[PDB]
Amino acid sequence: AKHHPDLIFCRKQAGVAIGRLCEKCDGKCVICDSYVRPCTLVRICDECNYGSYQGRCVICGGPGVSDAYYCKECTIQEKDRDGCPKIVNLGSSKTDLFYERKKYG
Amino acid sequence: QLEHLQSKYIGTGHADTTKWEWLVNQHRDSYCSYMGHFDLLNYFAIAENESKARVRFNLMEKMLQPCGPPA
Amino acid sequence: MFLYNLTLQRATGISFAIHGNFSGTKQQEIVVSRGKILELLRPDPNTGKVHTLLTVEVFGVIRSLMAFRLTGGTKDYIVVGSDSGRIVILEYQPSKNMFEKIHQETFGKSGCRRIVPGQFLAVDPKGRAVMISAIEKQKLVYILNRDAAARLTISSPLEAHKANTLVYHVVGVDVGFENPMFACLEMDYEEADNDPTGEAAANTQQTLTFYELDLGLNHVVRKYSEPLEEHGNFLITVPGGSDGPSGVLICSENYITYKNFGDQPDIRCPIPRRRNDLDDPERGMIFVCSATHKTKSMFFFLAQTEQGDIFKITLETDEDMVTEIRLKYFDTVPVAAAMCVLKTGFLFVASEFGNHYLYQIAHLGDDDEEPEFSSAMPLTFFFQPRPLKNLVLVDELDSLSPILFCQIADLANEDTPQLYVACGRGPRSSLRVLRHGLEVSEMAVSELPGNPNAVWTVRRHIEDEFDAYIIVSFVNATLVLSIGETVEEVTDSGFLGTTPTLSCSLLGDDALVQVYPDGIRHIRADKRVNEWKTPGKKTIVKCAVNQRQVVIALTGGELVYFEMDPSGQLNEYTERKEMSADVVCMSLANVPPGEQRSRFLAVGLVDNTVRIISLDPSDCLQPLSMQALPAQPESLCIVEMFLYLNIGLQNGVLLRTVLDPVTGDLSDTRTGSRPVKLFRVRMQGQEAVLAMSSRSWLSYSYQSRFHLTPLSYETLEFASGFASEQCPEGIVAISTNTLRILALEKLGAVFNQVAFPLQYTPRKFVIHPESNNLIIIETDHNAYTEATKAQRKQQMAEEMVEAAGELAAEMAAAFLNENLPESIFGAPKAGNGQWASVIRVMNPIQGNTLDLVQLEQNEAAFSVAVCRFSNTGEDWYVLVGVAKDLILNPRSVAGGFVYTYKLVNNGEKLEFLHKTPVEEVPAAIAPFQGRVLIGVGKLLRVYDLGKKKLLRKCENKHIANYISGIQTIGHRVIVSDVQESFIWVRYKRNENQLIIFADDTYPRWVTTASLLDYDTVAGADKFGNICVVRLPPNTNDSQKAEVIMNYHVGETVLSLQKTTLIPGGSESLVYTTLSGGIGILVPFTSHEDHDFFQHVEMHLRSEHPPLCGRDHLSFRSYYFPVKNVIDGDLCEQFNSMEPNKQKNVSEELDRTPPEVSKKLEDIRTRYA
Amino acid sequence: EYIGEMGKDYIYAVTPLLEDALMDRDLVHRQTASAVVQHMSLGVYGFGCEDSLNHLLNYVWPNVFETSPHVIQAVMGALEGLRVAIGPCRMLQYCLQGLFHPARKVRDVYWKIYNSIYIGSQDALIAHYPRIYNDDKNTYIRYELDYIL
RNA sequence: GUGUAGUAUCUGUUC
RNA sequence: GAACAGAUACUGACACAGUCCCUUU
Ligand SMILES: [Zn+2]
Ligand SMILES: [Zn+2]
Ligand SMILES: [Zn+2]
DSSP states (O other): OTTOTTOOBOOOOOOSEEOEEOSTTSSOOTTTOOOSOEEEEOEEOGGGSSGGGTTBBTTTOOBOOEEOEEEHHHHHHTOSSSSOOOBOSOOHHHHHHHHHHHHTO | OOOGGGTSSTTOOOTTOOHHHHHHHHHHHHHHHHHHOSHHHHHHHHHTTOOHHHHHHHHHTTSSSOSSSOO | OOEEEEEOSOOOOOOEEEEEOTTSSSSOEEEEEOSSEEEEEEOOTTTOOOEEEEEEEOSSOEEEEEEEOOTTOOOOEEEEEESSSEEEEEEEETTTTEEEEEEEEEOSOSSSOSSSSOSEEEEOSSSSEEEEEOSBSOEEEEEOOBOTTSOBOOOOOOOOOOSSEEEEEEEEEOOSSSSOEEEEEEEEOTTTTTOTTSOSSTTOOOEEEEEEOBTTTTBOOBOOOEEOSSOOOOEEEEOOTTSSOOEEEEEOSSEEEEEOSSSOOOEEEEOOEETTOSSOTTOOOOEEEEEEEEOSSOEEEEEEESSOEEEEEEEEEOSSSEEEEEEOEEEEOOOEEEEEEOSTTEEEEEESSSOEEEEEEOOOOTTOSSOOEETTSOOOOEEOOOOSOSEEEEEEEOOOOOEEEEEEEOOSSSSSOEEEEEEOOGGGOEEEEEBSSOOOOOOOEEOOOSOBOOOOEEOSSTTOSSOOEEEEEBSSOEEEEEOSSSOEEOSSOOOOOOSOOOOOOOSSSSOEEEEETTEEEEEOSSSOOOOEEOSTTOOOOEEEOOSSEEEEEOGGGOOEEEEEOTTSOEEEOSOOOOOSSOEEEEEEOOOOSSOSSOOOEEEEETTSEEEEOOOSGGGTTOOOOOEEOSSOEEEEEEEEOOEEEEEEESSSOEEEEESOSSOOOOOOOOOOOOOOOOEEEESSSSEEEEEOSSSOEEEOBSSSOBOOEEOSSSOOSEEEEOOOSSOSSOEEEEETTEEEEEOOSSOOOSOBOOOOBOSSOEEEEEEOSSSOOEEEEEOOBSOOOHHHHHHHHHHHHHHHHHTOOOOOOOHHHHHHHOOOOHHHHOOOOOOSSOBOOEEEEEOSSSOOEEEEEEOOTTEEEEEEEEEOOSSSOSOOEEEEEEEESOBTTTTBOOEEEEOBOOOTTTTTOOOOOBOOEESSOEEEEEEETTEEEEEETTOEEEEEOOSSSOEEEEEEOOOOSOEEEEEEOSSOEEEEESSSSOEEEEEOSSSOOEEEEEEOSSOOOOOOOOEEETTEEEEEOSSSEEEEEEOOTTOOOOOBOEEEEEEEOSSOEEEEEEEOSSTTOOOEEEEEESSSOEEEEEEOOOHHHHHHHHHHHHHHHHHSOOTTOOOHHHHHTSSSOOBSEEOHHHHHTTTTSOHHHHHHHHHHHTSOHHHHHHHHHHHHHHTO | OOSOTTTTGGGTTTHHHHHHHTSTTOHHHHHHHHHHHHHHHHHTTTSOOHHHHHHHHHHHGGGGOOOOHHHHHHHHHHHHHHHHHHOHHHHHHHHHHHTTOSSSHHHHHHHHHHHHHHHSSOSTTTTTOOOOOOOSSSOOOOGGGGOOO
């Protein structure tokens, strides 16, 4: 998340839906990308969870197999009291990798 | 480029912020803090022989144009 | 250097009150929200004594509290909006007696923020949606739909954020089953900042817009826009649909407006005014609160004004239109911020300050003789107030919430430090005295010389509500009486009482058992004499009476077991017990409701050993277990509330033991050098115990709570109980050569109070060393002096006479004939810069005034302190600071004066001596070494007594702000700034110069301060923060100070003092707050206890979150991080936790819950 | 970061290393030192260890005048982590001096820091606000806090 | 081994 | 210290084979 300056969160009022995480994003903090002390749960806005977006990873958009939590540092800093952490940007790195794979097979 | 956090809030300053707007925002926030607290308002109620309603009314119609007229 | 936080009293200030059926039944209950404490209480129509039910701390600031019910349900759900960024919905479980969290939604950051919602809470009357709005730019709407599981659900919040807008008040509007509608006092300010010509505040009115809630499309948009011509403050809901038309009221200055959507034009009505008000005619009038008694027959709206007058608004409306609004005069009450009318005529008024009363409606006031008012009458309204006729006072609540000054000293002949608290505002101001114990009621006193030993009550029937026999026995005299409301000496008793009586019980229905040292006596209504004489000259010691079993004890331990068969004749077992000591006390278990006999038994011995014996015939009178005690036991008894046992010894100890053959816990406290004897007493229809000592101790059990509190009376030997209709609860105690009757009307658990009324609001008071008198000064804003009031009344009478009303105006004499009392009708006063000053001397023993001192209109008294001068003799001088034309909101003053008295006749007389001019009003008086320090504004002057006026010798000008307090120690002096924390000042002797050598770095709004040691200052803060600043021990005599402690209580503290509360205790830091709560700070003794408490608190912080979802660590670290302080409330919350979590935490800590409870209660017992 | 609340005892040993690191030798060392300070301050939060943390701010503060995004982000994170542990008064005092500097870039960076501290924990700021004397036209004095009982 | 951003350090010519 | 053009290093617990999350007159 922090490693990519081109990604912008939705930053909208949270609803009742629960964010989901895939296999390779199991124990990673959504905001600060940590691996220690999951404390609270992640809430996402309604429009980010509709139709094909149901049950998807918040970072990479993969299939949802694990829940999304917040670390203790984010709770202490009160950075969890914000909009939904869903990433709306498609990501330049993923598209470039896909196109390179297409060109070399 | 990552500055949207400071753009969706009320009272946030910027490069060309002068003294008047900062002071009036400070006064507004101070009045809101006075209204929110209970014992901080009880202190004012004891200090001057009025009631809670009169103090609340004075604070409500003192938030419009504090620190004098603009310039 | 680590302290512990403890609480003694609970906040009594009332801010919100909501009525409803929170238990789901048909009995109304009241929910009251304190500053940071949520309390639930209900009334009782049969008695009228209101008893608290639930009290839980929320650890946060509550800004709103509403209740609602679903469309079809019978339970009321509480919605609380606190300073946090989340909304919580609460529920009440009568069985669990605890609030249960239901739903929790977050919508922003925590704390009191301008744009964060939580201030105004809007709830639809039917209970289909809830709206929460912020001060600026933020509004939220929730839909509380219910599911098929008979529960409730919450949906996602909606968006209604208007840009750059202010909100005054939000209230729901009844629509009658269509889309809900909300109304608010919308206001715009964008053009205010766009006008540099200074024409923004003028011609800028507020509007009233309605917000729609479409359940279909699920969005909120602005619908209406109705600008007003006045400036309203708050709205009033009106029932709609079937009963009455839907609409809102517009409370304003001297006007009330009814508004509705559709074809309803605006209607105005002037506010009635009292006859010949004593206030400024140009002053406006507003409303403070209202009420809604939505009776099925008709609905009427209550109201209250600034002066405290209750009106009765009746809506005379057509089916679709409205004709006129009719007003009425109802009664007069003290100023209140929130009131609610209840069913069956009950009315609850929560006064802003002072005591809270609960009135009962006896007369409905249907078309009273006094004329009413209506909007149909063209052109002001006048009405003459009358004393309370419609309402009668039945019960009152004691609440010394507005504490302004606290002092601890011993003035009486006793050896207990009395607590003096100055509270109250205006005419209701009083000086209350707090003392540990219970209230004592005196009904009658009978003087019977002699040496009484014991007294018992025997009733002819097992469930009689009145006594039948009183065994008034002495050492060598016997007397028996009977109560018939004309108590005399009974004649047909025939008990043959010659020797002193040792036993009077009830074994059957009307069976009396008497014990004398030469045998055993049995008394029955019929001619049945089961009397057996003791063989030989041996004397029986005592017997163990009970409901169905009597066990006698003889010398040498040869106890005899007697069991009463249903036939009646006694029986003796075929076994006997023998011990090698004497028997002084016996214990018998209470009979079970179904079982005829019990099993537990206790026997006390002179050898300091107590044993448990099984009552079964298989092993009757056999040694089962062994237990040892330090001292010789005196008596033993078993009490219920599920039963607890207390062990009495020859010394002042009362061990707490659970029902168990094995030994239990050892919990004893101070209870002098007198034996403790257990005796059953009556306490609110429950089972309790009684103990005797140098001071009598009463122990009760309210919701499984134990508190060994004493009684506020002299030494007593024996006591009993008395139950009747006029006196449901009472205690009968026999004193030296006299008999006394006692009763406990109020609960009076701790800190009994006594009311001594004053004139104005007290500011400060001191205590004379030898005179032992309180010099109390008062000062009020916008007040009238008695001479000024008399002159103005004379001028008004002259004007009325000159009015020439046909010459034949008799109203001028009628008005002056009677004056309205200030304490019942309030104090009508007005002005802008009018002050007052009163100086009084009061005797602590009896609250009677000694001398009266009055000043001019523009004279204000601020500081008073008795002082002495070295150059003079033993004359005590009193100096009072006086201001001249002081106005509060703008800073502009002309000057001041300093008074000087003589204290003639050692404190019972005063006389004016002289004055002196000062540029600024003095701050405080600090006498030391025969020298008095005068603080004039930002300067610091040194003044010594002269011949005709005070003379100035030394001055210092280095304080950068206004000085609001000076504290002096035997060597140096500390000056309390208004913005800076502290400024250390050293006064040189050889050259007579004042210098500064120490100051702090963090500015603090310090109000009060105190010194704990030679280099420790316990400063305070205006907001509520408490900090201790200690100078480094390696400083010369810049040198910046350091902070060693920080804490946040959430309430403003205006008093600090480090003394000892209980005799033989330890130096504790007791403090009081303006809210009304009293707390103490206790330092730790050992590191093991410190780390155990720290671990307990750390576990409980994450295991037991607060009810309102507020971060406890962040709340305590509100302004500054907490340093070396442990919160005691979280630790004390251990008792009310669930058993499973208690077991889990006990296993985690490798301790037992009884051990944890004992460890927690050790600190409370030691330091209280 | 991993130790958490048990790192309060091991602050004395790392002070000389932090003292060496904060010197303007290379950007990587400064960034790593700022990260260390942020993590330690977040870990020791709530234990009243302000005495040791106050000294580090005097050397952390001069690391704000740089054009490298990585070091700027590290310094901002360190300041945000220290804010919850030391109190906003120190940073408010530091920012008040350079808030109205005649230059431009210093004003921008000071305003950014002030916005960062103003967004979070805004409630605990009214008490720490200073007193500014007013002119003859406008009023800049809050007389309500000068009330005396 | 490959790619995606940023930063720093040494050079051809010119102010 | 403003630039048109080259070479060498460092930082971000950064990423690396995805086959499918697909879609009308
Ligand atoms: Zn979203
Ligand atoms: Zn993923
Ligand atoms: Zn995190």
